[PDB]
């Protein structure tokens, strides 16, 4: 096995409207308090449940937000969905859907949670990435003691991610959380372990991908 996914837009504009979708293994089983939910967390904040739906379209709603939200599906299309009001940028968050399994009608299970969505809000639109290899001009190490990678810059918003020869050379990795580039953009670093003296007998590749532009690009580290 069981896994969940959610997906939607990578950015929303200031006072526009979000919409999102959620699909899964575990397909529409009518099990032990079985349902699905939507949850969000403010930037670095606590968790917040929004809403959920069960083994028939019995469905339930937050008191404080109510008109701000609405929930349904086309059962045949096998996505759970969520639809919302127009947006104040504070509604930016880590958002997730999740699976429910509450017993005979009590006792909590949210027994699976999806990889989530980077729901992000600004008055501005998307901007695409610039990528740079980082290997230095002068060198002194020997053997597999070294590590190298690529910078990413000038994009907005996140996510961007990196892989090492389509996963095939993944070892001794470091990855750093991205930082706001002070013009109102973002920047990222990720690194992989390498032989200090044997670059070019094999090639080490930054496989960079950026969802908002859907830009995917491969560059040599050496």
């Amino acid at each position: 096995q069981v896994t969940l996914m959610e997906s939607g837009p990578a950015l929303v504009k200031v006072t526009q409207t979000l919409a999102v979708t959620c699909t899964f293994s575990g397909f529409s089983i009518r099990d032990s308090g079985k349902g699905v939910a939507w949850i969000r967390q403010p930037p670095g904040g606590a968790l917040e449940w929004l809403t959920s739906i069960y083994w028939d379209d019995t469905k339930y709603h937050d008191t404080s937000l109510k008109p701000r939200l609405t929930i349904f599906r086309d059962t045949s299309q096998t996505q759970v969905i969520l639809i919302l009001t127009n947006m104040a940028p504070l509604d930016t968050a880590t958002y997730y859907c999740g699976r429910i399994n509450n017993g005979g009608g009590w006792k909590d299970h949210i027994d699976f949670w999806g990889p989530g969505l980077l729901v992000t809000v600004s008055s501005a639109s998307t901007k695409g990435p610039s990528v740079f290899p980082l290997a230095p001009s002068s060198r002194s190490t020997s053997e597999s003691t070294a590590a190298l990678g690529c910078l990413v810059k000038d994009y907005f918003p996140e996510p961007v991610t990196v892989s090492w020869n389509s996963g095939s050379l993944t070892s001794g990795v470091h990855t750093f959380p991205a930082v706001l580039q002070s013009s109102g953009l973002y920047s990222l670093s990720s690194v992989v372990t390498v032989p200090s003296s044997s670059l070019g007998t094999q090639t080490y590749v930054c496989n960079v991908n950026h969802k908002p532009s859907n830009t995917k690009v491969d560059k040599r580290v050496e």
């Binding site: 670095g44 968790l47 997730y96 017993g103 009590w106 006792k107 909590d108 299970h109 949210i110 027994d111 949670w113 999806g114 990889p115 989530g116 959380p177």
Partner: peptide
């Protein structure tokens, strides 16, 4: 009927204790 979960940061949360 309180369940428990945890949040190692920047990542999807993880299930802990259930029922009671």
């Amino acid at each position: 009927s309180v369940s428990w979960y945890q949040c190692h940061s920047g990542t999807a949360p993880r299930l802990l204790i259930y029922d009671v």
